[PDB]
Structure formats: C-alpha cells, structure tokens
Amino acid sequence: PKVALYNQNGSTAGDIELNASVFGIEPNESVVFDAILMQRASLRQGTHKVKNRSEVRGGGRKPWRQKGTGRARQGSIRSPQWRGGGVVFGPTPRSYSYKLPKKVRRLAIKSVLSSKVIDNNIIVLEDLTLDTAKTKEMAAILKGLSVEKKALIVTADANEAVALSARNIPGVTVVEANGINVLDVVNHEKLLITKAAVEKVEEVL
C-alpha cells in the first residue's frame, strides 16, 4: 500500500500510503468469483415467454371420436406433439437476481482492489482537473500515462466535466466514487483513481 503518485502530464510525486485494511488484504479467489457471478447474472433482464398449451388460440373440440377410427386417439389440435404447437416447460418471465451478505460484498470489493494493487496496475492520479469537454485532451492524458488497454477512471468531483470527454474514447468508462463494483473494476484491467476518491472510498470501506 505504497503505490506511487502521478500528475496529469505523467510527472510522479511522492508515493501515497493506502489503507492496508482495504488494499493489502489477501484477495479471496472464491468470494471474487461469486461476486462477479452475482451482478453478472442480475444484469440480465430475463424477459421471455412461450405460449403454453392453454393459450394457443384454439384447441377445444375433440378432433375425432375416441374409438372406431384408424388414427391415434387424440385431444385438441393445439397439443405438444402436434405441428400446431404449444410448447411444454418453456421459458417464462423470471428474475435472475438475488442478494449477498454485506460482509461478503465488502470482502469482494476489497479483494479485487487489493488484487489490482499487488499486480501493480493501480495508478493514483491526484486532482484530475480538466477545463473542457474535449476528448483528445484526455486521450493525450492517457497516452502520457501509457494507458493502452481498457481502463476505469473514478474522479468524484470532475465527473461532471470529465465524463463527456471520456465516455466515447474508446470503451473506457468514467464512474463516480460510489459506482465501483466488481465487474466494472475487473473488466477494465487498469484503474485510474484520484486522491480525493482514494480517501473517500477508504472512508466508505
């Protein structure tokens, strides 16, 4: 928890101490797995329906008398084995979301953050000020920081100004300090964190 500090133009200042209780924690493989799975499942809206036998606009009459005919003894026209359809045990509108314990979710977020810290892909960027909405300014910022792949940036106050600049380029996300999760962290492989948000998340956790 002694990662270096970085400026807008890549200049590095004296490193910053981080709460070991949040960033030095040994990551929990399994808890991180379930935490990922959690909202990965809850995100889907799960809207699907297929017309069961009862609601296929038809059926009704016995197609032919029970006995005295060379055909199979049958029921209404809209029945599962018939071509007319009517599915059996099909999908149904249902939610794919649940809840996890407070301790578990806190441990998950702490674990993923500490995993990033030990992998040394965290980059603390104090005071991500920006005077304009223009994207190529922040593209130059990322180039100066050598941020090539996906990334996430959190800046709490400059979110209003910086979100417009960042949102298009090119799949990077701007989130607020309260918006951290497990997928939004893991998926982006590079976390940009402003010092105000450092201590804010530190206090929250």
Binding site: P27, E29, V32, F33, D34, I36, V112, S115, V186, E189
Partner: protein, 146 residues
C-alpha cells in the same frame, strides 16, 4: 482475477441430473421411477401423511391441551454472558439491546444462573432465578428486580 480464467470454489458446483435421456446415464425409459406404479405417473404422488387407508398415526393418536393468548416469554440471558461487561457497570435492557446480547426484548429480560461470574455490577432485569440472584450477590453486585 481476470474473467478469462474464472474458476469456481471446487466442490460448490454440480451439473443437473437430466433424467430421462438415453440409457447410458441410467434413468432411461423409466426415468428412474419404476414400472407402472401410481408413483410412476405425473402428479401420481399421495398425501404426505397418507398410509394406504390404514388410518394415519396422527389421527390414531389423541389431542393434547390448550394454548392461550397470555404468555410472558422472557429473553433468557445467562450469567456467562454478563462477564463481557466491564467492572462496576450498570446493565439494563436498553443497554443489552445495543450490545446485542438480546435481539428481542420480548416480555422482558430474565437472568439465569448458568456460568461463572466475578465482577461488580448493578443488574436491572425483569426477573431473576434463585441461583442467579445469589450468584450475582456473591459476585458483589445487587440483584434489584424491575
């Protein structure tokens, strides 16, 4: 982690048992439900307490006494729990609520005498067991009943 090597907690995963598909997995033609029994047909189960017309055990047995609306169930707390408080403190139900020793005040706290206690207290409880009272008095506190 990264997503592209997700691995669950091994032993916390099991594939479903897709009954009634082929013979290689057993449970084929019969779907693991025998031959032509009443149990073998859809919705073919029976009432859980049924006994084939032989009168069930519950109905053979007699009924027991009543239950009434009035009932002072007291949140039990033993002396062993009281040790967690410091020396010379005043312990009362409202304090017990925040400290979490009881999650439901209920009809009222009641002190029970199981444990070993050596601390000085002013204990304020709705009821006291005979042994618990003398136990806290020996410990040096005063069992004053609410």
């Amino acid at each position: 982690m990264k997503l592209h090597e997700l691995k669950p907690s091994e032993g916390s995963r099991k594939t479903r048992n897709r009954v009634g598909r082929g013979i290689g997995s057993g449970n084929g033609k019969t779907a693991g439900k025998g031959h032509k029994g009443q149990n073998a047909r859809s919705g073919g189960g029976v009432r859980p307490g049924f006994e084939g017309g032989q009168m069930p055990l519950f109905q053979r047995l007699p009924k027991r006494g009543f239950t009434n609306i009035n009932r002072k169930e007291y949140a039990v707390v033993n002396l062993d729990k009281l040790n967690g408080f410091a020396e010379g403190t005043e312990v009362t139900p409202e304090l017990l609520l925040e400290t979490g020793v009881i999650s439901k005040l209920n009809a009222g706290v009641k002190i029970l005498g199981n444990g070993k206690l050596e601390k000085k207290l002013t204990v304020k409880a709705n009821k006291f067991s005979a042994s618990a009272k003398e136990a806290v008095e020996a410990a040096g506190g005063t069992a004053e009943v609410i």
